Design an enzyme around this catalytic site. Structure first.
Site, short mmCIF file in Angstrom:
data_model
loop_
_atom_site.label_atom_id
_atom_site.label_comp_id
_atom_site.label_asym_id
_atom_site.label_seq_id
_atom_site.Cartn_x
_atom_site.Cartn_y
_atom_site.Cartn_z
N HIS A 1 49.94 -76.09 35.63
CA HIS A 1 50.94 -75.30 36.38
C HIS A 1 50.28 -73.97 36.81
CE1 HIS A 1 54.49 -77.66 36.10
NE2 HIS A 1 54.64 -77.48 34.80
N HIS B 1 48.67 -79.11 30.24
CA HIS B 1 49.78 -79.17 31.19
C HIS B 1 50.16 -77.78 31.71
CE1 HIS B 1 53.75 -81.09 32.29
NE2 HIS B 1 54.06 -79.83 32.29
N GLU B 2 50.22 -76.78 30.82
CA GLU B 2 50.62 -75.42 31.25
C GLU B 2 49.49 -74.79 32.12
OE1 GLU B 2 53.54 -74.79 30.97
OE2 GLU B 2 54.21 -75.92 29.26
ZN LIG Z 1 55.67 -78.78 33.31
#
Ligand SMILES: [Zn+2]
Ligand SMILES: [Zn+2]
Lengths: 164, 235, 165, 235
Positions: B212, B208-209
């Site tokens: 981003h 997830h990171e």
């Molecule tokens: Zn997030």
């Protein structure tokens, strides 16, 4: 004020899955056109550059790295442009294919179904030892930790999760 | 790599972060092209977060956790480096993760630093200063740093150094990203008397990171302040 | 700078019950309970001051008895009402923690959303009068195999019973 | 009971709602002590909602549905009356439902209308005007009315007439409640390639509205405008 959710575009697109549907088609399209225009502005800045500052690389090299990054087209005179179909594919890859929900499916783990998280349970873990967690299977090793995500169950595989 | 491996100025070195004022050099490991790991608590990338003490006013979230000693010894730093590297390998072991990591490596922050349009110049905040064996340093471009958490040890996030005032993460350029993360903790969630108590696999959290980070490296992220309301079907 | 999260109502959370009732903290729960206990005392006090009744539809003794029954008031030998703290707590608990949507799902043994929040767009026309469609005992999950895995509530499997709007 | 059953002024009658200005009498059915069913679209209890047209500005909810002809014929009103009565029987068939319905019947709105402390007086809006066979009317106290939806046919709710400006639903007194409901429609939700598409059992929806009604009848409801934010664990 009504009951409901307060959600972020950046989070919804990053998590993907079901939540991605909360961004309407119009806004999705507006964002896409916006970033397509940003990429064209990068191609335009590259095309104006005829020299390179600093001694760490040659201009041709640096232009090639950005053609590769942004998947720009280059004509016979060396001019770059952004091809709409190449852009759409790349933009789709980066905002709809690379998502937390898609990685869950590749890892075959149990996970939350939305980015929103109101849980208070947090655990200390130790994944370095292969007896605890592997590259191949995560916590769900092949004892019965590979069925029903028992490796991720904090009661069943309690030795691996110490509550803070 | 192990934390105690000797520096070479190439993939193992003491580094300083540009704009991280008077910082003492910290030991960092280049685990792959364009991607470095710094096994230290992040007291560097937020000028307003220079220490590890709980905030004057408590953060309004479901849970936070403070311990100014976490990630202070060599043994912990070795384990942090090994845990982060293992999560990278796990992501890379999937077709999707290999694709995402390749996109990250290709996602070099644009050279948009010239004020003259006929010259191409780097933006020098997309770099780190890498100390060499002889004591000299070399400014080196990088795409991504994985760094330990700040005061709140379980707060993970992808950020630029300070705040993205030039909108590099939203204008197509992209900038060097820092992911505050720890492989030593994970959140629990309820799922399925018969409600199983499960734990998030930290490879998913890291992915997830990383997502981003790729949005922010390609300059196509949406401002994190952009939030909207979705009303319920009331009854 | 606004965070992501939920915007939720006390009334809805308490009505639905189950997991969502945990979003109301102990402090707030206690503050509401004391507040309504004080409202009940105000009703008991209003009744004790009343010595006559307006209108001819009922006597004052009848009305006092009905409200003694409604609010489970204690009544001393002189006819004075008061609110007993333990009777109040039991009644307040019945009304706000026992009668909940989640507790009904469990009694009916149906499948249902797990939170009051609903963002669905699918709405169906249904016809429950016919006992071939929906029963008092079983709802849509009649005893063909509509009684297994909530197939009676499955809009694909029991598609004849649900016409999408 | 059936819709075409003759009036008797006791459990089948044409009625008018106090404060519902110049309304034509509507046919209503007392299906149990203190509880009536009116098979009509609710153009009465909200002075700002006198018709069945879609609003000028679209309601900001996931889904709404408009059809000014729904619930306009005797057949539809018979099926509505029978659908509601069957859902009441389903709730009553459970121990929990039998208790809930008993609490609702015992929850008579307090006689808090007096401005003189030595006198007890009804609040005359906790009544309906019941037309008798001879054409006269009788003001009768009641606790609950189930009535058809307003313009949005799939919007169910428990409300007072107009708004609770005396705070009777939240001050321990209680007041007559109106549940806008239709047994003819129900919402779907997704649960469990393998995602089942399920429908909410209308008895559960009716039970949820009856739970609001009992709060509001015992004057222990909390204002529906009282909302609070719960922040997520950001990452
Ligand atoms: Zn997030
Ligand atoms: Zn409700």
């Amino acid at each position: 004020e009504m009951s409901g959710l307060e959600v972020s575009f950046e989070e919804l697109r990053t998590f993907g899955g079901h939540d991605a549907k909360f961004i309407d088609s119009l806004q999705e399209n507006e964002f896409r056109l916006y970033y397509y225009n940003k990429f064209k502005d990068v191609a335009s800045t590259l095309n104006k550059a005829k020299s390179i500052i600093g001694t760490t690389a040659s201009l041709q090299y640096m232009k090639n790295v950005f053609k590769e990054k942004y998947l720009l087209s280059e004509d016979t005179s060396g001019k770059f442009s952004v091809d709409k179909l190449k852009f759409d594919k790349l933009y789709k890859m980066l905002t709809e294919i690379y998502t937390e929900d898609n990685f869950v499916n590749f890892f075959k783990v149990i996970n939350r179904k939305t980015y929103l998280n109101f849980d208070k349970a947090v655990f200390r873990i130790n994944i370095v030892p292969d007896e605890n967690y592997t590259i191949k299977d995560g916590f769900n090793l092949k004892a019965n930790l590979s069925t029903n995500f028992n490796g991720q169950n904090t009661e069943i595989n309690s030795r691996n999760f110490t509550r803070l | 790599m192990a934390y105690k491996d000797p520096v070479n100025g190439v993939d193992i070195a003491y580094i300083k972060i540009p704009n991280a004022g008077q910082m003492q050099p910290v030991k960092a490991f280049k685990i792959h092209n364009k991607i470095w790991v710094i096994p230290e608590r992040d007291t560097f990338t937020n000028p307003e977060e220079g220490d590890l003490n709980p905030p004057p006013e408590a953060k309004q979230v479901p849970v936070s956790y403070y311990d100014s000693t976490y990630l202070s010894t060599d043994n912990e730093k070795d384990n942090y480096l090994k845990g982060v590297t293992k999560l990278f390998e796990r992501i890379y072991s999937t077709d999707l993760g290999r694709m995402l990591l390749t996109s990250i490596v290709r996602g070099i922050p644009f050279w948009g630093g010239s004020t003259i349009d006929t010259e191409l110049k780097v933006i020098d905040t997309n770099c780190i200063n890498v100390i060499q064996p002889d004591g000299s340093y070399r400014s080196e471009e990088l795409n991504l740093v994985i760094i330990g958490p700040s005061a709140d040890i379980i707060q993970f996030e992808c950020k630029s150094f300070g705040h993205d005032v030039l909108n590099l993460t939203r204008n197509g350029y992209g900038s060097t990203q820092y992911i505050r993360f720890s492989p030593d903790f994970t959140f629990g969630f309820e799922e399925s008397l018969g409600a199983g108590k499960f734990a998030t696999d930290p490879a998913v959290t890291l992915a997830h990171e990383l997502i981003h980070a790729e949005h922010r490296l390609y300059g196509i992220a949406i401002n994190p302040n952009r939030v909207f309301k979705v009303n319920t079907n009331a009854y």
